[PDB]
Amino acid sequence: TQRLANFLVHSGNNFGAILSSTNVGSNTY
Amino acid sequence: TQRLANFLVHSGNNFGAILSSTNVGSNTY
Amino acid sequence: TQRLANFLVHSGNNFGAILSSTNVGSNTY
Amino acid sequence: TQRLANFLVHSGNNFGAILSSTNVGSNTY
Amino acid sequence: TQRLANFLVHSGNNFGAILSSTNVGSNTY
Amino acid sequence: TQRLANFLVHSGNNFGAILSSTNVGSNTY
Amino acid sequence: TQRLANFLVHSGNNFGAILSSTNVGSNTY
Amino acid sequence: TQRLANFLVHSGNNFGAILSSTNVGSNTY
Amino acid sequence: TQRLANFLVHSGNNFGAILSSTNVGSNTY
Amino acid sequence: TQRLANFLVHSGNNFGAILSSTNVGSNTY
Amino acid sequence: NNFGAILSSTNVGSNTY
Amino acid sequence: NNFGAILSSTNVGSNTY
Amino acid sequence: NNFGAILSSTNVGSNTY
Amino acid sequence: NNFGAILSSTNVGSNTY
Amino acid sequence: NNFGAILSSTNVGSNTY
Amino acid sequence: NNFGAILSSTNVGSNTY
Amino acid sequence: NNFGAILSSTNVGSNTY
Amino acid sequence: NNFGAILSSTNVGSNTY
Amino acid sequence: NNFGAILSSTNVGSNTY
Amino acid sequence: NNFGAILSSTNVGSNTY
């Protein structure tokens, strides 16, 4: 059982998520 | 059992999600 | 059992999702 | 048992999903 | 048992889905 | 323009969905 | 324009969703 | 424009969602 | 433009979500 | 523009979320 | 007289998991 | 007279996990 | 007379985990 | 006379974990 | 006469963990 | 000699939104 | 000799929003 | 000789928002 | 000789917001 | 000889906000 992962990212301008996990509620009652 | 994954991304301008997991509720009651 | 996956993406301007998993509720009660 | 997959994408302007999995509720009660 | 798959896509302007899986509810009660 | 809807449900044991909207990806690349 | 909706549910044991909206990714790359 | 909604739920034992919106990633790279 | 919503819930034992919005990542890289 | 919402909940034992918004990462790199 | 809807549910028994 | 909706739920029993 | 909604829930029993 | 909503919930018993 | 909402909850019993 | 796959994409132009 | 896959993408131009 | 995968991406130009 | 993967990305230009 | 992975990224330019 062997798992290998490789990631290479190049970003000029970032306004969002890269390799990220985001949670937002924004709920209304 | 062997799993290999490779990722290469080039982004000029990012406004969304790249290799990301996002959750948004935006619910209304 | 062997699994190999390769990904190469080039993006100018991103407003959505690339290699991403997104969840949105936007429900109304 | 061997599985091989290769992906190459070139995107100018993205407003939707590329290699992505999206879920949206948008339900109404 | 061997499975090989290759994908090459070139996109100018995207407003929908490319190599993507999308789910939308949009249900009404 | 008038819309009227009425729902009545009686459930002993639930393992699935009742009056629900579910989305599952379970995709593989 | 008028919309009226009524819901009545009785549940003994719940393991799933009742009047709910659920999203699950469970994707693999 | 008028919208009216009424909900009544009786639950013995809950292990899932009632009138809820849930998001789960559970993704793998 | 008028919106009216009414909710009444009775719960013996709760292990999940009632009238709630939950987000969980549980992602792996 | 008028919005009215009413909530009434009775809980014996609570182990989860009632009228709540919860976020959990639980991610792994 | 009914000009709307009448829904009746009656269950006699027990639920065991 | 009913011009709306009437919903009735009656359960006689016990729930055991 | 009802021009709205009437919802009635009656449970007779006990819940044991 | 009801032009709104009427919600009633009645539970007779105990909850044991 | 109701032009709003009426909510009633009645529980007879005890909760034991 | 090819026993696999060869995919070639060539685009000459510009994309304007 | 190729027993796998070769994918080539070449774009000459500019992207303007 | 290739028994795996070779992916090449070449972009000549500029991105302006 | 490749029994794995080879990924190459080349971009010539500038990004302006 | 590659039995793993080789990743190369080259960018020539500047980023201006």
Residue numbers in the entry:
A (entry chain Q), B (entry chain M), C (entry chain I), D (entry chain E), E (entry chain A), F (entry chain B), ...: 9 to 37
K (entry chain D), L (entry chain H), M (entry chain L), N (entry chain P), O (entry chain T), P (entry chain C), ...: 21 to 37
Sentences from the paper on this structure:
Human islet amyloid polypeptide (IAPP) is a 37-residue polypeptide hormone that is co-secreted with insulin from pancreatic β cells and plays an essential role in glycemic regulation. Here, we used cryo-EM to determine structures of amyloid fibrils at different times during in vitro fibrillation of a disease-related variant of human islet amyloid polypeptide (IAPP-S20G). Strikingly, the fibrils formed in the lag, growth, and plateau phases have different structures, with new forms appearing and others disappearing as fibrillation proceeds.
However, 2D classification revealed that the sample at 22 weeks is less polymorphic than at the 6-week time point. The increased proportion of 4PFLU fibril segments enabled the structure of this fibril form to be solved to 3.1 Å resolution.
